[PDB]
């Protein structure tokens, strides 16, 4: 999650 | 009809169900209703994890971005109750299909895609296509929001 | 723990939804099948490193100790056994706090507190502060073991 799975989000 | 929008849909109905059975309390927090919908079973299937903020169960929607089930409250103009799902990241191709697969079956109040708010809940492809941002390489750049009953 | 509970709760979760999808094959290391969880998204709420580039993410819990999936001896000439989520260097109450909290989620074969294998997935607060040991200095000492059918 890795890779999938941004940096931002919510 | 796909896992996807199907995702979407399950999860609407599966919020709407658990906000008519709470008697005595709201929620005022996306993080708190989303982990109370996770702990419902509401989003087997879909990946999901731990807020190291609140220690909230947190989802994530098939392309890696996050999706937020949160109570409508009050934004010093804002009446429109009910509740609302919100899906970053969105790739470009899965922002026309899903938003305009929401506007024919997602019993929807109300779709968002980026800054472009569809009160009248009906979203047709031709403007999702024009709304919806093209993609960073793998990475999708939009924004949708499913408002629940205003 | 609170974050930490979840975190462990939904990866197993997520590990759950993944070998569903697994036939024919299995894996056998946890080096292996923690770095595709990884890749899957699955481990969101976690601290991960490595090299996810390459195929070798490794996965760390909140004091820096490493968190393993493993494959529970895979191969049973029909469907995919169990796994367990190993997770190192807890400090003594956290251990306390996790391991009841697991037993409590119910979602266990069975939880391992260092050498004691509680195979019934139950471990009381009185059994984890006497399991549980002592931190070194800030180093926690304690060794959680989450079994998974089987």
């Known amino acids: 999650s890795x890779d999938x799975d941004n940096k931002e989000x919510x | ?150």
């Open chain 2, 1 to 150: 009809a796909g896992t996807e929008l199907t995702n979407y849909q399950t999860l609407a109905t599966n919020t709407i169900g658990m906000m008519k059975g709470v008697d005595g309390y709201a929620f005022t927090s996306g993080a708190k209703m989303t982990d109370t919908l996770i702990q419902a079973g509401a989003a087997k299937g879909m990946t999901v994890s731990g807020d190291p903020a609140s220690g909230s169960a947190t989802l994530w929607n098939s392309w890696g971005g996050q999706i937020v089930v949160a109570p409508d409250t009050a934004g010093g103009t804002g009446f429109n109750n009910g509740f609302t799902i919100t899906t970053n990241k969105v790739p470009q191709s899965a922002c026309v299909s899903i938003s305009t697969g929401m506007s024919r079956s997602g019993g929807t109040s109300g779709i968002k895609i980026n800054g472009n708010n569809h009160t009248d809940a009906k979203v047709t492809a031709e403007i999702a296509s024009s709304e919806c941002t093209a993609d960073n390489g793998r990475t999708g750049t939009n924004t949708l929001v499913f408002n629940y009953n205003g």
